[PDB]
From Swiss-Prot, chain B:
Belongs to the V-ATPase G subunit family. Residues 33-53 have a biased composition (Basic and acidic residues). It is found in: Melanosome; Cytoplasmic vesicle, Clathrin-coated vesicle membrane. The lineage of its organism: Eukaryota, Metazoa, Chordata, Craniata, Vertebrata. It comes from Mus musculus. Subunit of the V1 complex of vacuolar(H+)-ATPase (V-ATPase), a multisubunit enzyme composed of a peripheral complex (V1) that hydrolyzes ATP and a membrane integral complex (V0) that translocates protons. V-ATPase is responsible for acidifying and maintaining the pH of intracellular compartments and in some cell types, is targeted to the plasma membrane, where it is responsible for acidifying the extracellular environment. This is V-type proton ATPase subunit G 2. It comes from the Eukaryota. V-ATPase is a heteromultimeric enzyme made up of two complexes: the ATP-hydrolytic V1 complex and the proton translocation V0 complex. The V1 complex consists of three catalytic AB heterodimers that form a heterohexamer, three peripheral stalks each consisting of EG heterodimers, one central rotor including subunits D and F, and the regulatory subunits C and H. The proton translocation complex V0 consists of the proton transport subunit a, a ring of proteolipid subunits c9c'', rotary subunit d, subunits e and f, and the accessory subunits ATP6AP1/Ac45 and ATP6AP2/PRR.
From Swiss-Prot, chain C:
Belongs to the V-ATPase 116 kDa subunit family. This is V-type proton ATPase 116 kDa subunit a 1. Disruption phenotype: Embryonic lethal. Knockout embryos die at 5 to 6 dpc, before gastrulation. Predominantly expressed in neurons in the cortex and in the dentate gyrus, CA1 and CA3 regions of the hippocampus (at protein level). Expressed at lower levels in astrocytes, oligodendrocytes and microglia (at protein level). In the cerebellum, present in Purkinje and granule cells (at protein level). Subunit of the V0 complex of vacuolar(H+)-ATPase (V-ATPase), a multisubunit enzyme composed of a peripheral complex (V1) that hydrolyzes ATP and a membrane integral complex (V0) that translocates protons. V-ATPase is responsible for the acidification of various organelles, such as lysosomes, endosomes, the trans-Golgi network, and secretory granules, including synaptic vesicles. In certain cell types, can be exported to the plasma membrane, where it is involved in the acidification of the extracellular environment. Required for assembly and activity of the vacuolar ATPase. It is found in: Cytoplasmic vesicle, Clathrin-coated vesicle membrane; Cytoplasmic vesicle, Secretory vesicle, Synaptic vesicle membrane; Melanosome. The modification Phosphothreonine is found at T71. The modification Phosphotyrosine is found at Y75. The gene is Atp6v0a1.
UniProtKB/Swiss-Prot annotation, chain D:
This is V-type proton ATPase subunit H. PANTHER family: V-TYPE PROTON ATPASE SUBUNIT H (PTHR10698:SF0). The gene is Atp6v1h. GO terms for molecular function: proton-transporting ATPase activity, rotational mechanism. One of its GO terms (biological process) is synaptic vesicle lumen acidification. Keywords: Cytoplasmic vesicle, Hydrogen ion transport, Ion transport, Membrane, Phosphoprotein, Transport. It comes from Mus musculus (Mouse). It is a peripheral membrane protein. V-ATPase is a heteromultimeric enzyme made up of two complexes: the ATP-hydrolytic V1 complex and the proton translocation V0 complex. The V1 complex consists of three catalytic AB heterodimers that form a heterohexamer, three peripheral stalks each consisting of EG heterodimers, one central rotor including subunits D and F, and the regulatory subunits C and H. The proton translocation complex V0 consists of the proton transport subunit a, a ring of proteolipid subunits c9c'', rotary subunit d, subunits e and f, and the accessory subunits ATP6AP1/Ac45 and ATP6AP2/PRR. Interacts with AP2M1.
From Swiss-Prot, chain E:
Expressed within the midpiece of sperm tail (at protein level). Kidney; localizes to early distal nephron, encompassing thick ascending limbs and distal convoluted tubules (at protein level). The modification Phosphotyrosine is found at Y55. The modification N-acetylalanine is found at A1. It comes from the Eukaryota. This is V-type proton ATPase subunit E 1. It comes from Mus musculus (Mouse). Subunit of the V1 complex of vacuolar(H+)-ATPase (V-ATPase), a multisubunit enzyme composed of a peripheral complex (V1) that hydrolyzes ATP and a membrane integral complex (V0) that translocates protons. V-ATPase is responsible for acidifying and maintaining the pH of intracellular compartments and in some cell types, is targeted to the plasma membrane, where it is responsible for acidifying the extracellular environment. Signal peptide: none annotated. Belongs to the V-ATPase E subunit family. The chain holds residues 2 to 57 of 226 of the full protein.
Amino acid sequence: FVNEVRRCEEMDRKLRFVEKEIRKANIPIMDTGENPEVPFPRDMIDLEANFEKIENELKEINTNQEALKRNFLELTELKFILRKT
Amino acid sequence: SQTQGIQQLLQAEKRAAEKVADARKRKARRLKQAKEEAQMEVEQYRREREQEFQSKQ
Amino acid sequence: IRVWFIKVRKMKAIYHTLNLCNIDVTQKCLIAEVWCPVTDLDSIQFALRRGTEHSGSTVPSILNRMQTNQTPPTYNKTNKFTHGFQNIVDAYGIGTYRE
Amino acid sequence: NIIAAKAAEVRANKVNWQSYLQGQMISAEDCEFIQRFEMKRSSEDKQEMLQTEGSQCAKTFINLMTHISKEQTVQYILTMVDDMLQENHQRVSIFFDYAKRSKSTAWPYFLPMLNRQDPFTVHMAARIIAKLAAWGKELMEGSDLNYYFNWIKTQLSSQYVQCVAGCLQLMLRVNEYRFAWVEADGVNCIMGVLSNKCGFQLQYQMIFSIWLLAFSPQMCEHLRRYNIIPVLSDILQESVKEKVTRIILAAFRNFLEKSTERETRQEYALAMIQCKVLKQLENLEQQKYDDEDISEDIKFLLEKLGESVQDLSSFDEYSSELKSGRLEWSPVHKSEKFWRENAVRLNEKNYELLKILTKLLEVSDDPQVLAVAAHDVGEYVRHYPRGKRVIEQLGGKQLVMNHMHHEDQQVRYNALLAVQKLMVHN
Amino acid sequence: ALSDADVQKQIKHMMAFIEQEANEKAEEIDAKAEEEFNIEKGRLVQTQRLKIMEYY
């Protein structure tokens, strides 16, 4: 049953990553409660699959925007070049 | 009590092995039998087709 | 996020308890042996029945009395005004059964 | 199990048949028959039962149980008589209760019964029915059962339902009459019982019956015009009972082993389109089972879906759909290989396909095709910057900029991904 | 006792299981035998048909 064990592990790791992202977003939690809301379907597997896909495009846009600001630095260099004559 | 815990296994194992072996030997005999019955029908067709050869002549 | 946090926590916990079983050679019914309070076994029966409704497969989910020579663990029912003293007394160790 | 408990309580009491030893009301001569060979266990009695030839078995008992109007005793008498029919490994073989003089006794006597589903008449009639699939007899008139209410009554609604369902499982054995009844409207009845919610065991035996039907390729072609396989994947997803999965796996194996014509048997791709079952197969891979058949079947499923994706991995079908404007979630659209290598093919003469996509941007407002086209353009510019320059010549950047404000938010995000791809060296 | 009756009804439950899956696998094996018979008979009767065609 170590298959269940390490899939639990990888959901844990993905959740830790998105937690770090939210800490960088400085959005506090609200703790609505309702502690007994854990069901028993196999739908949880493809739900967390959807979620890991979701933060995969989060990583994608992260690299895109840091490279975009990298480019924008040369863009500001270009407009400063335009300023001088 | 604890005795069913092996009787389950033994009955299931017998019911599996018996039918598996049955199918193996059944196929082994059936290939040959299919050949011989096919040949029997074949020679019956030979005979009746000799008959309508004679009628056609 | 928090609902999925607690969900995955419960999932790994129950899978660890599943690891804490006896896999029969091929019997589809697991076999376990668990200490149960003598004052709540009927509540446990109700829980087993609840397992039957929440998963409808005509499954019996039986719990049966049996005896052993092994020493049972000791338990104490504390509360708000009894838990701290129980921590105090148990910080030094635990005594034999029915002490 | 109604029938099991009924047989058990039957076995606890024996009728006093001797009181009517020579009474025509109850077995004037059949009492002497049942007196003989009371040691039915003995194989000597089994092989000497044929000495009767059926002159009393199924020739005197026949049209005699109906004569005995007393239900309370005739039920026990008939079920004790046909307990031999119940076990019946080969003790009948080729209709040892022969009665060759009239065939009315053998096959067509089932017509008066199929009524009174409570005095065991219907269950006994079903047992009599279930004596030709794997036996030495054949029913001349298949329409005398195929359009009869012994299966139309059980199509609704209850142990009798699965009992007659098991009898029907026994029926579906040889293609000759299976095809005949499949040509009838009973296929739509099978679909009707597929749609309604019922017990898991009924669904289980139903999928086994689909397995029985799977043996005939022409029947597979006939039923290919329905969406059964999506339903199969749905029931696989919703329930896991460790034998229904086995039967479904074997059914897919037999479907794709009987592929007379893959050109029309598009199930290999349609099952993927209507449900991404490959993740379920991957999940089942992680669990080791004692049945090697499951491992062989999952390996076969994996490899055949592999070359299914290879079949769907092509460029000329994509171009044909591009001309027709059909822009679905094709496997080629998610195919990393296609974008990695065949992007050079998209550098056509005048880039006509890309131009057609550009036109589709300003004429087609459908969110789905627009998302597909946006992602395709983004990948194309990702793998060919000069194509991006040609697009900027065409002014497509401002067009996608107009499309970022579309009412479908996910299309806005797809166009955003395409734009993000457009921003390399820009 | 209550647990005693539970044990006996468990015995009938596992007998029911045994017969269920055992009948199942029995029909599985028998069916597989049937299709293998069908293909082998088809092959051999096909060869016989061919020879018939040339002779006639």
